Write an enzyme that holds these catalytic residues in place. Structure first.
Site, PDB file in Angstrom:
ATOM      1  N   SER A  74       4.272   1.111   8.766  1.00 10.41           N
ATOM      2  CA  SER A  74       4.120   0.179   7.531  1.00 10.41           C
ATOM      3  C   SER A  74       5.283  -0.074   6.855  1.00 10.41           C
ATOM      4  CB  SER A  74       2.902   0.549   6.788  1.00 10.41           C
ATOM      5  OG  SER A  74       1.541   0.499   7.521  1.00 10.41           O
TER       6      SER A  74
ATOM      7  N   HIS B 200       1.094  -1.073   0.017  1.00  9.47           N
ATOM      8  CA  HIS B 200       0.147  -0.001   0.072  1.00  9.47           C
ATOM      9  C   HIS B 200       0.980   1.125   0.065  1.00  9.47           C
ATOM     10  CE1 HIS B 200       0.296  -0.723   4.597  1.00  9.47           C
ATOM     11  NE2 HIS B 200       0.249   0.819   4.506  1.00  9.47           N
TER      12      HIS B 200
ATOM     13  N   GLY C 107       2.965   5.361   9.761  1.00 13.16           N
ATOM     14  CA  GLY C 107       4.421   5.506   9.362  1.00 13.16           C
ATOM     15  C   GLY C 107       5.211   4.219   9.803  1.00 13.16           C
TER      16      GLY C 107
ATOM     17  N   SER D 118       1.454  -4.299   7.757  1.00  7.92           N
ATOM     18  CA  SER D 118       0.507  -3.635   6.709  1.00  7.92           C
ATOM     19  C   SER D 118      -0.533  -2.940   7.403  1.00  7.92           C
ATOM     20  CB  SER D 118      -0.219  -4.953   6.697  1.00  7.92           C
ATOM     21  OG  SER D 118      -1.398  -4.630   5.824  1.00  7.92           O
TER      22      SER D 118
ATOM     23  N   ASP E 254       0.105  -7.505   0.217  1.00  5.76           N
ATOM     24  CA  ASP E 254       0.405  -6.113   0.844  1.00  5.76           C
ATOM     25  C   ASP E 254       2.046  -6.064   0.860  1.00  5.76           C
ATOM     26  OD1 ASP E 254      -0.399  -3.648   3.474  1.00  5.76           O
ATOM     27  OD2 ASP E 254       0.877  -3.459   1.628  1.00  5.76           O
TER      28      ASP E 254
END
Lengths: 4, 181
Positions: free
Chosen positions: B137, B33, B135, B152, B55
């Protein structure tokens, strides 16, 4: 419930 | 740059998951993402992305010498990574990310389906009781020197605590024919  | 450090594109910030090699060429894994946002990153050019459903995404480094095969512990130290593995329920794990740093907890579920509303649904996610914030991820989920996942999403935060889901790192490695450094 979100993307980090 | 090591696992869990900041990677940005314009005003967006995500964390690096793992530095890997594809046919000897240095790349970095991060969340999909994140890589859907742009092809241009502080560390290089995106060369792959898969979100939602999965992801994960991959960026080729502009600077190969920056491909540090470790995870930053946010205490002036690093954890060496040597392999990638599959998570198991009850495993003691750590997560490194650019907002909250290093956090620890245990794997509480596998193959979890996560509905992010307008962002879509992801499947087969590792579930943990480790906290994370925006932040964080794409950052590293590891156990010692074994790489396990990429941050994720989830719920909650690091003060109240929460639930976090990670993309299994072996599915991202096989997608791109990559090996952890």
């Amino acid at each position: 419930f979100x993307l980090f | 740059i090591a696992g869990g450090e900041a990677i940005t594109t314009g005003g967006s910030r995500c964390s690096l998951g793992f530095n890997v090699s594809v046919n000897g060429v240095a790349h970095a894994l991060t969340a999909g993402h994140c890589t859907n946002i742009s092809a241009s990153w502080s560390i290089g050019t995106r060369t792959g992305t898969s979100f939602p459903n999965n992801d994960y995404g991959i960026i080729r480094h502009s600077n190969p010498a920056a491909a540090d095969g470790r995870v930053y512990l946010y205490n002036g130290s690093y954890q060496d990574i040597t392999t990638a593995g599959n998570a198991f329920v009850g495993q003691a794990v750590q997560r490194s990310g650019s907002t909250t740093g290093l956090r620890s907890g245990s794997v509480t579920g596998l193959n979890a389906t996560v509905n992010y509303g307008s962002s879509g649904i992801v499947y087969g996610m590792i579930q943990t009781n480790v906290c994370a914030q925006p932040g964080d991820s794409g950052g590293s989920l590891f156990a010692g020197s074994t790489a396990l996942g990429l941050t994720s999403g989830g719920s909650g935060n690091c003060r109240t605590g929460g639930t976090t889901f990670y993309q299994p790192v072996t599915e991202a490695l096989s997608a791109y024919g990559a090996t952890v450094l």
